[PDB]
Design a protein around this nucleic acid. Structure first.
Ligand SMILES: Nc1ncnc2c1ncn2[C@@H]1O[C@H](COP(=O)(O)OP(=O)(O)OP(=O)(O)O)[C@@H](O)[C@H]1O
Ligand SMILES: Nc1ncnc2c1ncn2[C@@H]1O[C@H](COP(=O)(O)OP(=O)(O)OP(=O)(O)O)[C@@H](O)[C@H]1O
Ligand SMILES: [Mg+2]
Ligand SMILES: [Mg+2]
Lengths: 438, 485, 106
DNA sequence: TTTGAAAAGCAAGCATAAAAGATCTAAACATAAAATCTGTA
């Protein structure tokens, strides 16, 4: 005897929730799992099921707000006691403190003491504790869910209050860890693009047709506005479904970012013409647009660090050497071959400080008592220390780092797209050093 | 004031902190402690487990045998008894402090012999030929904390309840400074001595160093499981204080085990009961039924137990299990309930000895589903191929898929392939894992058949057999489909 | 019959009566009348929908939920990982494979 | 202007240094009930 609500593309899931969740504790499982990835309508379907059956007693917990297992136990005790106080206000109760629950055993004792003072009730009832997002706990281990599986066996069997657990999970592999427990599971597969578009239209067209920018636009310049909002949502879906996938939240964010810019380009010619309005605002559908000072010594030290990380030390003398030799001796010959793989795609290498200072002095911009080469003074080492403090460069160790040890090596910690823009700010030709190696 | 965290379940005992050195103002101020009303031993829970008996239970012909063969009810330990008794009697009568080290395997009568020694010593003290002493029993496996022995022994001596540190200086003051004329001899049984071994080894040093004090009048009888414990785990000080003399309790021979079982079966074997044929209740002296347990069965069980362990607990339990098998068959035959010759035969003794030997692992693997057997077959195939003891799970997936797709012409594979990869259903697409793959993986992990490493990539994760390879091979080629291919 | 086929399938894959009960319970509970229950227990058509839902979030169904660009990036990462020795890859090599693949398509 | 030849370069082999992290342990930081002290009434 239960009401099955209408959810647009979750009919099987809603029928399963009608099959498993009822007010009778004999024909209800002790544990029930709803498994699906993010934005698959698990919470939406559970809310529509419990709203259409107001006689079912449900307690809602978000483990993401609790983070650890001990606040989860204390939250269980507190919320069960508050819900049982609200439900039967004419039953006198001792108020057990939630903060005395530090073990699962103490939760069993506290739930025993709470449920033993409601035996004056005439019928057996269910209390549905919903842990919406169990595996979204931040400090999760493999042993925590076993305690919640076996929790119902330590509570009395003839109690008037019989607690029932409903779990929500995201990842398949976490659920697959507990397959031999044979817990009933309802799975929420990801929507396809048609159901995503239908959900987006039926959930956002009402908010779009009454937004203040459109209401100012139609007086500055219901069904037709509904068609305008729906056509915008369909255009957003076909423009950015490959970017977002079947993600309701990302498409919702894109709709929110691009709706007022779309409304601002609506004229009295564009309003009844969809193709003309799309051509007026086509630049909203060509780019996702999901987006939001440093010293000369530190820039050139970053360029030298990038060169030191992504070029071999043996070919240094073939690239930077320029001095006239008083003493006879051949310089480096250079590399014969070109690399098959771009080194910038891989992890950076580790170098010494003296090599970094040598290449920094070789690439820094410029008589008898001048010495135009810049030596490594206080400011170079100070800028290097800021460069490590910002982690634009990094080391092998990060905690209790010995800066002065010779065993400690250094690497660059910026990608190529950052060092390119930094080298554009100083007019250095860094791409010349990688055009002839691969 | 707002707390950063709370401790809401702190349970602290009512233990004082001031030790015995500060009770009296002087050494001469201490009275004779044997006259104090709290010192030297001068239960409320036994009535809690009482109920009203409103039924009449039936005790059958084998009921008295099973009740009598329990461990709750000293033939073969008479040299060890004489050694422990003579050392402890000489230590009591001369007012000395002595360590007696006793070691042995489980169930060879160490605790029984030391308890019989202290009962004869208390009886001898009751006849006023040795001075009176207090007997303290400390079991290291019955303590929550190892320092609680400090809590226990001092509470047995003074009757005070202190924390463990204050109890430790109280015991040190009592054993060193208090004179002999104001004290009473104390005999301490330290049982499960290895359980009282810590990193600091302070409890070991204190308990064996008090036996080196002139005024102590302390006899420590320490029970160990090995004889090389003071050399392996303890330092040279504690090993020197324990001493060179060390009493080893050997495992019982089959003559000794047979003597123990015959001592428990005196008055019942070759005896007659009056047995009711209506209910089954039997009375020791309606039919007159003779009860026997054969000596050949007892000697077989004694020889087996003596070769495996020499354990009196196992010999008594094997005899009791044989009697219970016989009594179960008796109640099945006569239809008796739980309200001319009956014999515990040698076949019941062989069944009791074989029921802990029959290797259910092969039987468990034989009674598994086809997917679990296919997993084990694929893993064994990989161990045969690349010769490694650990195989990646993706390799097992690929070789299961190969085993299905190569021997397709088998009729069982043509029957099972749609079940394995589509669960017998159109509108279910072809699956990368087999049906119930994670189920049989977790099931073999639960049994201890498999070990799986802790990795989050399911393909490069390794799986090892925890059981022997030959029993997995014989379980696999017991299966008619898997041995066919 | 269809029950005997599903019982044989369970016997050869799970060999578990709780696994069978977890599918039989919503077959009984979703019937509105007695004729619907008899039709459900003859056809066992609900058990196939149940088995399809129990496999809807594995690798195959998650692959079928992917977009075309998602599939292209996954394919490029897969072939880079196949060409690698340890199977390791990053975003840069996968994007390089993706752009070579898109240029060779276009 | 050639020459060639010792300096530079490349790759396989393999022992070994080192990065990463799994596991743990001490030390600072923190709370708390019972016992003990202590300064007066
Ligand atoms: N079937 C549906 N019909 C209408 N709106 C839906 C439907 N499914 C989802 N939505 C809308 O999409 C939103 C996201 O769904 P929901 O919060 O239930 O997802 P979820 O699977 O619980 O996600 P998560 O694991 O990230 O919390 C809902 O709040 C609702 O506005
Ligand atoms: N000589 C014996 N005569 C009779 N019964 C014996 C004898 N030795 C042992 N038993 C029986 O075996 C039981 C177990 O022996 P006991 O507790 O003395 O063993 P233990 O050697 O101290 O073993 P553990 O190391 O396990 O403590 C005794 O309670 C008794 O029933
Ligand atoms: Mg949710
Ligand atoms: Mg013992």
């Amino acid at each position: 005897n239960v009401t099955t609500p209408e959810v647009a593309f979750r009919e099987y899931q809603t029928n399963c929730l009608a099959s498993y969740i009822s007010a009778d504790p004999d024909i209800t499982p002790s544990n029930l799992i709803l498994q699906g990835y993010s934005g698959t309508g698990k919470t939406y379907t559970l809310k529509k099921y419990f709203n259409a059956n107001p006689n079912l007693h449900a307690v809602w917990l978000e483990p993401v707000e609790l983070v650890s297992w001990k606040p989860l136990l204390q939250a269980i005790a507190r919320t069960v006691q508050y819900k049982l106080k609200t439900l039967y206000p004419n039953i006198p109760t001792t108020d057990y403190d939630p903060l005395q629950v530090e073990e699962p055993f103490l939760l069993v004792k506290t739930l025993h003491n709470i449920f033993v003072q409601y035996e004056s009730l005439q019928e057996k009832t269910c209390l549905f504790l919903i842990l919406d997002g169990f595996d979204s706990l931040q400090d999760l281990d493999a042993a925590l869910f076993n305690k919640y599986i076996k929790l119902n066996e330590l509570l009395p069997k003839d109690s008037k209050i019989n607690i029932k657990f409903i779990y929500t999970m995201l990842e398949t592999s976490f659920l697959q860890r507990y397959s031999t427990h044979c817990i009933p599971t309802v799975m929420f597969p990801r929507y396809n693009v048609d159901e995503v578009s239908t959900i987006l239209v039926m959930s956002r067209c009402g908010e779009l047709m009454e937004d203040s920018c459109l209401r100012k636009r139609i007086i500055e310049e219901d069904d037709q506005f509904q068609n305008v909002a729906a056509n915008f949502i369909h255009l957003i879906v076909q423009a950015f479904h490959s970017y977002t996938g079947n993600d309701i939240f990302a498409l919702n964010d894109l709709i929110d970012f691009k709706w007022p810019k779309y409304v601002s380009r609506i004229t009295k010619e564009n309003i009844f013409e969809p193709l003309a309005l799309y051509k007026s605002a086509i630049k909203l559908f060509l780019s996702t647009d999901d987006n939001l000072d440093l010293s000369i010594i530190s820039k050139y030290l970053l360029i030298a660090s990038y060169i030191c990380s992504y070029l071999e030390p043996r070919y240094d003398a073939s690239i930077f050497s320029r001095k006239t030799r008083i003493i006879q001796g051949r310089a480096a010959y250079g590399r014969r071959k070109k690399k098959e793989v771009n080194p910038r795609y891989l992890q950076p290498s580790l170098f010494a400080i003296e090599r970094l200072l040598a290449i920094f002095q070789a690439i820094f911009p410029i008589a008898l008592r001048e010495e135009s080469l810049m030596k490594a003074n206080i400011e170079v080492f100070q800028n290097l220390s800021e460069l490590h403090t910002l982690k634009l460069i990094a080391t092998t160790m990060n905690k209790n780092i010995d800066y002065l040890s010779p065993k400690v090596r250094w690497k660059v910690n910026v990608p190529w797209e950052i060092i390119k823009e930094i080298s554009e700010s100083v007019h250095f030709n860094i791409s010349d050093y990688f055009s002839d190696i691969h | 004031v707002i707390r950063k965290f709370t401790k809401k379940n702190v349970a602290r005992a009512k233990k004082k902190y001031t030790p015995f050195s500060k009770r009296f103002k002087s050494i001469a101020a201490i009275p004779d402690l044997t006259s104090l009303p709290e010192f030297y031993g001068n239960s409320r829970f036994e009535n809690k487990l009482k109920t009203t008996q409103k039924h009449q239970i039936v005790e059958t012909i084998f009921s008295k045998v099973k009740k009598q063969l329990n461990s709750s009810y000293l033939p073969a330990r008479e040299n060890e008894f004489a050694s422990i008794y003579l050392s402890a009697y000489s230590a009591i009568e001369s007012d000395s402090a002595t360590t007696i080290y006793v070691a042995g395997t489980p169930g060879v009568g160490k605790t029984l012999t030391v308890r019989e020694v202290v009962k004869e010593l208390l009886s001898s003290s009751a006849q006023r030929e040795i001075p009176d002493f207090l007997y303290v029993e400390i079991n290291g496996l019955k303590m929550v904390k190892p320092t609680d022995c400090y809590e226990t022994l001092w509470n047995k001596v003074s009757g005070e309840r202190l924390t463990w540190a204050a109890s430790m200086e109280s015991l040190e003051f009592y054993f060193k400074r208090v004179p002999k004329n104001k004290k009473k001899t104390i005999v301490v049984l330290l049982d499960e001595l290895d359980a009282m071994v810590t990193k600091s080894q302070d409890i070991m040093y204190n308990f064996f160093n008090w036996t080196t004090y002139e005024n102590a009048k302390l006899i420590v009888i320490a029970v160990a499981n090995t004889m090389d414990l003071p050399e392996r785990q303890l330092g040279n000080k504690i090993t020197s204080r324990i001493g060179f003399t060390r009493i080893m309790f050997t495992g019982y021979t089959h003559e000794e085990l047979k003597n123990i079982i015959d001592l428990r079966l005196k008055g019942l074997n070759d005896s007659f009961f009056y047995v009711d044929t209506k209910t089954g209740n039997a009375i020791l002296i309606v039919r007159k039924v003779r009860l026997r347990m054969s000596a050949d069965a007892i000697e077989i069980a004694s020889r087996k137990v003596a070769s495996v362990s020499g354990d009196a607990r196992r010999a008594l339990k094997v005899c009791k299990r044989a009697a219970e098998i016989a009594e179960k068959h008796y109640m099945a035959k006569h239809g008796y309930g739980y309200d001319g010759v009956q014999t515990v035969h040698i076949t019941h003794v062989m069944k009791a000895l074989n029921e802990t030997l029959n290797s259910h692992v092969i039987t468990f693997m034989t009674r598994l589903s086809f997917t679990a057997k296919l997993f084990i077959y694929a893993l064994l195939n990989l161990m045969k191929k690349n010769g490694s003891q650990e195989q990646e799970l993706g390799d097992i997936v690929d070789e299961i898929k190969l085993l299905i797709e190569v021997n397709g012409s088998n009729k069982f594979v043509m029957e099972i392939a749609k079940t394995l990869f589509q669960q017998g259903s159109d509108n279910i697409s072809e699956q990368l894992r087999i049906i119930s793959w994670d189920f049989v993986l977790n099931q073999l992990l639960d049994a201890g058949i498999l070990f799986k490493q802790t990795m989050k990539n399911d393909r490069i994760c390794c799986v090892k057999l925890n059981i022997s390879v030959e029993e997995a091979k014989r379980a696999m080629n017991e299966d008619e489909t898997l041995r066919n291919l | 019959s269809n029950l005997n086929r599903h019982i044989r399938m369970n016997f050869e894959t799970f060999r578990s009566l709780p696994t069978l009960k977890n599918s039989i319970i919503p077959l009984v509970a979703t019937s509105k009348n007695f004729g619907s229950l008899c039709t459900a227990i003859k056809s066992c058509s609900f058990l196939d929908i149940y088995n399809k839902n129990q496999l809807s979030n594995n690798l195959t169904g998650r692959l079928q939920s992917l977009s075309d660009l998602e599939l292209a990036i996954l394919i490029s990462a897969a072939r880079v990982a196949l060409r690698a020795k340890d199977g390791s890859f990053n975003f840069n090599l996968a994007y390089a494979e993706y752009e070579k693949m898109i240029k060779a398509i276009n």
